[PDB]
Amino acid sequence: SENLYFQSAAIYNIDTSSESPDHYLVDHTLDGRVLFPATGYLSIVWKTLARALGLGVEQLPVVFEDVVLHQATILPKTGTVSLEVRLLEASRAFEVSENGNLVVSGKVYQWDDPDPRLFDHPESPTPNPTEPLFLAQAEVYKELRLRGYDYGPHFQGILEASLEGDSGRLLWKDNWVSFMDTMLQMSILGSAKHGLYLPTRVTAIHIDPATHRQKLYTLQDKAQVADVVVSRWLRVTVAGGVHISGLHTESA
Amino acid sequence: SENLYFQSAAIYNIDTSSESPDHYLVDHTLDGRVLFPATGYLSIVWKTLARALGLGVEQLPVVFEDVVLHQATILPKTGTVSLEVRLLEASRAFEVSENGNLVVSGKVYQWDDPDPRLFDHLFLAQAEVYKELRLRGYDYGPHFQGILEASLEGDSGRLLWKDNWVSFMDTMLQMSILGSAKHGLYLPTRVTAIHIDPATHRQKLYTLQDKAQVADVVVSRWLRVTVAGGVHISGLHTESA
């Protein structure tokens, strides 16, 4: 036999029913299907590394590298989806599978020397050359809906965004999956491509929970928010303590 | 989400083509089908524990307890199968799955200070043994024809050792089947305990004039125990199918 060994593994049984803590996932609909979000895979891999290290995720700065999404995961209206995460033996590589089929691959590891400066927002050489006209929340999600990205309330975290989709303000509700998804939504917002494009690859993602808590601010209505910047030129989306580099999307 | 954690896992990608070291598995056919043997699950679970302990199986005396076989694994025409073993976190429990479906559960653990005393104990020739088994629906090809001789009542005999734990232990299950009063086609669904001690096994093996290595096997209905070499099987339960 060809034998493959894993230093640790975990299984996450996902239930989208009304009373489930994962009910929020029903608000992530793309081309009329409820898709488990790419950032949900990041969350369960992060939780698996945290378990292997004996840490809480909120105390675990983490790096993902060379993430590849091999297929989409449909969440049915009724039943449960079981996603398995495996950490490869003597390696930083990980796999996510469903019913044995590979869904995600990549490398994941504890970030030993978190650099708060990584989360500084990138700056152009000169200010904005055309006058920026901010779009409100409902306008943002209209535009997204028209192109096939149907986000219900739990995934509507973009409160405002620039006309070019290069800056905005994201809600924080102590949910890493939806926060990080709204960073990907911002990356999509300013794209000129037509139709539904879904993430297939991400070169690197850095998360530092301490820097995140510092970068959050509170609005007069007590909502917590973080500012987001997208540089398509630099292949970078940054918000709070999350830095996403080299997002690639493909027609779906 | 409900989260389940595992201290270790391993995936065994099995190919039964003639080029593969696992070709021998094509000789374990039941009711016309190539069935992955229950003792093959024991083998891959043992190998997974050995990996976690930094040991080879030959240095790992091992106990299985409360084994439950939830379904049979019939190999496809492709002749391939992928079996995953998970060791549960902070526990002796294990799972074997195929395509996410649970195939085997139970407990497995390193046997500290094995006690060799556990293994202390007209005929039917090999061809007659396998004629009888075939009449009941058990089709064993040459790699699984390890019963050399058996008692007329099927409660004692000699088993060949071909440096194959899977086929050796399968022939112990075969002896259990041979002497049963029920002659239908039954597959294992539960085993209360299996002890394996490679050291006692090497001591129990003996060589015949032709240089073949063998071990004596005993089946005790009173005790529901089958013992051979350094393997002790207790509480084998089989059901029809």
Task: Catalogue all structural domains in chain B, each as residue range(s) with its CATH number.
Answer: 6-240 (3.10.129.110)
Of B13, B84, B97, the CB nearest to A1: B13
CA angle A124, A127, A128 (to 5 degrees): 100
**For residues A228 and A237, what is the distance between their CA atoms, to the nearest angstrom?**
7
Residue whose C-alpha is closest to residue B98's, from B17, B31, B186, B14: B14
Give me the catalytic one of B170, B195, B197, B232.
B170
Q: Which of A4, A82, A86 sits opposite B100 (nearest CB)?
A: A82
Is B152:B208 a contact under the CB 8 Å cutoff? no
Contacts of B22 in chain A (CB under 8 A): 1
CB of A183 closer than 8 Å to CB of A244: yes
Distance, in Å, from the CA atom of A189 to the CA atom of A141, rounded to the nearest integer, reads 9
Partner-chain contact B84 A99, CB within 8 Å: no
Separation between Cα atoms, residue B197 and residue B60, nearest integer Å? 7
Contact status, residue B84 vs residue B10, Cβ threshold 8 Å: yes
Neighbouring CB atoms inside 10 A of B36's CB total 23
Question: Rounded to a whole number, what is the distance in Å from the CA of A118 to chain B's nearest CA?
Answer: 32
Q: Report angle CA A3, A96, B71 to the nearest 5 degrees.
A: 60
Task: State how far the Cα of A21 lies from the Cα of A43, in Å rounded to an integer.
Answer: 14
Q: How many of the other CB atoms lie within 10 Å of CB of A104?
A: 23
Q: Which two tokens stand for residue A219?
A: 């609005």
Number of CB atoms found within 10 A of residue A225's CB: 20
Q: In the sheet where B33-34 sits, what is the strand order?
A: B33-34, B28-30, B138-140
Strand residues in chain A grouped as ranges (E): 2-15, 28-30, 33-34, 62-69, 80-88, 93-98, 101-110, 135-136, 149-151, 158-161, 167-172, 197-207, 217-218, 224-231, 236-239, 242-245, 248-251
- The β-bridge partners of B98 are B101
| Solved with | X-ray
Å from B8 to nearest chain A CA?
Answer: 5
Question: CA B129, CA B136: separation in Å to the nearest integer?
Answer: 11
Restricting to B residues 37-96, those with a Cβ less than 8 Å away from any Cβ of A are 44, 47, 51, 82, 84, 86, 89
Per DSSP, B35 falls in state: B
Distance from CA of B1 to the nearest CA of A (A): 5
Q: Which helix (H) or strand (E) holds B235?
A: strand B231-240
Helical (H) or strand (E) element with A52: helix A38-53
d(CA B144, CA B165): 11
What is the DSSP annotation of B161-175?
A: E-S-HHHHHHHHHHH
Please, what is the Cα angle at A122 between A236 and A104, to 5 degrees? 15
**What is the Cβ-side half-sphere exposure of residue B59, based on CA atoms within 13 angstroms?**
7
Strand segments (E) across B92-132: 93-98, 101-110, 124-125
Q: Which residues of B touch A99 (CB under 8 A)?
A: 99-101
Question: In this structure, are residues A175 and A24 in contact, taking their beta carbons and an 8 Å threshold?
Answer: yes
Torsion of CA B152, B154, B160, B165, to 10 degrees: 170
Cα–Cα nearest to B178, from B234, B134, B114, B116: B134
DSSP-derived pairing of the beta strands A33-34 and B33-34: unpaired
Report the DSSP beta bridge partners of residue B158.
Answer: B149, B216
Q: How far apart are CA A186 and CA B175, in angstroms?
A: 67
A98: left (phi over 0), alpha (psi -120 to 50) or beta: beta
Residue A8 neighbours by CB distance under 10 Å: 22
Using an 8 Å Cβ cutoff, are B44 and B86 in contact?
no
Amino acid B53 reads L
The question of whether B28 is a catalytic residue gets the answer yes
What is the rounded distance in angstroms from the CA atom of residue B196 to the CA atom of residue B191? 14
| Angle (CA) A12 A16 A22, round 5° | 60
